[PDB]
């Protein structure tokens, strides 16, 4: 049939690299693009089409227990090995990431319907806010 | 409170570039990472945590009408300008993308609960399959 209405999620994606190389996309973009999945939302009325695509990558899971130092490989970022230790400071979850980089850690806490995440490395602080979906 | 259970979607992300530069992530990865959103699914029981993060980028929408040639900028890929023309071949939607690259187009059709997408550029064919979610 001719109706392509719906939300579609990618199952399979073959030779995406050759296609991208043929368009002269640089090596560093290609390396990231090939490990993504796509969702496609198609709204169609007669012969008018609206298409919204989003690309997604699932980083690896982290499982830990507060108080037990664990080994973590940050392969969603710099792919280094750090010894991480997570503890409560009040209701703030605090993690020190012992490794090559000095002063590497993060803090995580709930205030209202928002989750706050402060990432630190050296002198640089990154601040992320999440809302409950 | 101490319970961080839930699905969380990022609202705000400040100084992600400085944090990443401090970890020596290369310029090309940083350029892509900073335009992503994150979803965080937190399962917590007492002091045991399981965290699943996924990064998402929403490509731009394409709207067209079958039979009306339209101007398209492929900024989710090589960011070139092409004159696109979409027509039915039976129940297969066929697009020719007139531009610098020769033999650039795609075909899209439904067979069962699967949507098929064949992307072509020069000699290279990429084949994607989507299932209805």
Swiss-Prot record, chains A, B:
Name of protein: Retinol-binding protein 2
One Gene Ontology term of the molecular function aspect: retinal binding
UniProt cross-references to InterPro entries, sorted A to Z: Calycin, Fatty_acid-bd, ILBP, Lipocln_cytosolic_FA-bd_dom
Tissue specificity note: Higher expression in adult small intestine and to a much lesser extent in fetal kidney.
Keywords: Cytoplasm, Retinol-binding, Transport, Vitamin A
Annotated organism of origin: Homo sapiens
Location in or out of the cell: Cytoplasm
Keyword Cytoplasm: yes
Keyword field contains Transferase: no
